[PDB]
Subunit: 247 residues, 2 copies
């Protein structure tokens, strides 16, 4: 069976005091890290602070990793550097980086190759916009997005996929647990037909839309949804209840 | 003017190499009131580097977000840097202009955010080989500087860096005399836009290839007030470069 994966994407948020208060509440929740992956993604400069405050049961990672190795690349964090610091996870291809920072499908591929070459576990994001879904091209876009990097996957416990319904984020539309499941089933079929049936049943596929304390249990209930990449709700203390649904 | 020597470690370093490198840096005795020395480690190394370096050394980060706090995955805001007492930020580095789509407007917005949050900024600019061969050095630098220069309210807190991109990775050399004439022109740009006393106050650093041999010939020039050092800042011999500014 697939080990459930609950991830906190703090994005560009937090202070030293707020993280101190939030990580304390997180630590009050008791769980087994061998049956459940719970990962926190703070700002890079908050990593050391966050890793020191969170108990060993919690996994940690960074929100981006360089497509370049060590060298003359100002502002970059290489996969080499991350591994030396024992950073376990990286987020690759988040919609906000594709939208605001020119991150292409090829950047996503180069980042994944760098991460897996350096023994990093990768959380890889993808999803279609509103205009793409209205043109009935949901599967076509996601297939193009997944096939950009899927051949690089050597271990299917170490690569975690995240579907982002960009058609239901900021647009004013809602994505039901059923509508997410239908895409998740397609993603697993894409993995199956390109990598194998056993590999597709190994790989975790998360829902990376608006997840809160109310809908998390109805989302995790679906057969092909193995967890979430949580945004705004992971900045609140009630994030422990979202972890409770996958327990 | 107070001299300013900066170590841009770029995308380099391990935990062990940094503790070895910082220890050798700690060996050098200088007065931080007479000379600014700033180390810019990778973001995930910042806390490690700050703990190991003695308080005489200033520290900073190699990039800062144009956005404030919010839904911007992978970004470090100026607000977050201020809360961590990160003193300095690098803005407009050629490598981020080249590989990461960073434009003059991004630089402006980054300087806007940094100054609002009481951060000190090391702002980079410079022309390509094509631009120099077309004799457009002054035109390009005027536009690059005028993109942000009006935002400076404190001329000790904003530091300019000239990167001669025509000399980096091409096979052509930049002389201290060539660097001086550009630095003089940059100061003339600041004078026309901000004032005479302000241009006399602002530090302008050479951001090309600096090592233990050329540093003293560069810093002796009247309009070059220090360096942004790349590769040579990764060696223990970086102390000799700091010594040339002493």
């Amino acid at each position: 069976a697939r080990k459930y994966f609950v991830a906190a994407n703090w994005k560009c948020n937090g202070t030293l005091e707020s993280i101190k208060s939030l990580t304390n509440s997180f630590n009050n929740l008791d769980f087994d890290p061998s049956k459940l992956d719970v990962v926190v993604f703070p700002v890079s400069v908050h990593y050391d602070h966050t890793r020191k405050l969170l108990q060993s049961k919690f996994s940690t990672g960074i929100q981006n990793v360089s497509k370049f190795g060590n060298g003359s690349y100002t502002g970059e964090v290489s996969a080499e550097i991350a591994k030396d610091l024992n950073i376990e996870y990286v987020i690759i291809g988040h919609s906000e980086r594709r939208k605001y920072f020119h991150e292409t499908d090829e950047d996503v591929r180069e980042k994944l190759q760098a991460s897996l070459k350096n023994n990093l576990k990768a959380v890889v994001c993808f999803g279609e916009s509103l205009e793409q879904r209205e043109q009935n091209k949901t599967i076509e876009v996601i297939t193009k997005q997944v096939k950009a990097f899927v051949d690089l996957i050597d271990n299917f416990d170490n690569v975690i996929l995240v579907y982002e319904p960009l058609w239901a984020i900021g647009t004013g539309k809602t994505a039901t647990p059923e509508q997410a499941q239908l895409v998740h089933k397609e993603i697993r079929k894409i993995v199956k037909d390109t990598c194998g049936e056993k590999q597709a049943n190994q790989i975790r596929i998360l829902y990376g839309g608006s997840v809160n304390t109310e809908n998390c249990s109805s989302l995790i209930q679906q057969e092909d949804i193995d967890g979430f990449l949580v945004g705004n709700a992971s900045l609140k203390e009630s994030f422990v209840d979202i972890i409770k649904s996958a327990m």
